[PDB]
């Protein structure tokens, strides 16, 4: 992969900690493949993932860089996870330092949004609940997963924040699942600059 070769510039403040090849015994499997626990701690938080053992990280603390490599480029399994493991570390490094954000735009007459607390259905103490008026008879209320900070600068604009991109973009898709953009009036929830082509009439 042409992306796995590119070094990963570790900006000041971020710290990458590579574990050791370990195997969690699984009674359902006769042989588990070793993995490596990689922690990426920094100002905003800490993210952890387990990479296959065939991926080798040359963590250069001097130049603050870390290049990836596989034990065999001829195997399809190792070529794929090489680039996928790089794309994840890139997000982790750029998520714990700067952070990931998603913007949702509510188009449609009568579409509002507020961030209130619903102590009745709190999954964890202090859970924030996004309350959305989307034209349904009932109120649509969703609790932000633990680790995300949601705010609404304007009634028709939501701003999600978090260090885990996969979690942030996944939670923005659940909110969008209630009102998918329509092609006749543009009403719906658009995520991160998403647009829809309109019809003539």
């Amino acid at each position: 992969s042409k992306l796995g070769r590119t070094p990963l510039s570790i900006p000041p403040g971020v710290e990458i900690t590579i574990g050791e090849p370990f195997v969690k015994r699984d009674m359902t499997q006769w042989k588990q493949q070793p993995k490596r626990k990689i922690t990426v701690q920094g100002p905003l938080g800490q993210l952890e993932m387990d990479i296959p053992d065939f991926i080798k990280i040359d963590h250069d603390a001097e130049a603050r860089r870390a290049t990836l490599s596989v034990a065999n480029r001829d195997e399809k399994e190792q070529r794929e996870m090489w680039g996928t493991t790089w794309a994840y570390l890139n997000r982790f490094i750029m998520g714990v330092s700067e952070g990931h954000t998603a913007v949702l735009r509510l188009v449609g007459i009568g579409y509002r949004a507020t961030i209130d607390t619903r102590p009745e259905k709190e999954e964890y103490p202090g859970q924030q609940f996004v309350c959305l008026k989307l034209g349904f008879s009932h109120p649509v209320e969703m609790g932000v997963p633990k680790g995300m900070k949601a705010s609404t600068p304007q009634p028709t604009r939501i701003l999600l924040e978090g260090i885990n991109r996969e979690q942030v973009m996944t939670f923005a898709a659940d909110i969008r699942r209630w009102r998918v953009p329509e092609p006749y009036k543009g009403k719906g929830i658009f995520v991160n600059g998403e647009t829809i082509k309109l019809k003539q009439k």
């Binding site: 913007v103 600068p153 304007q154 701003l159």
Partner: peptide, 9 residues
């Protein structure tokens, strides 16, 4: 770009 879209409208 995000800030412009955020505060416009």
């Amino acid at each position: 770009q995000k800030q412009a879209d955020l505060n416009d409208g």
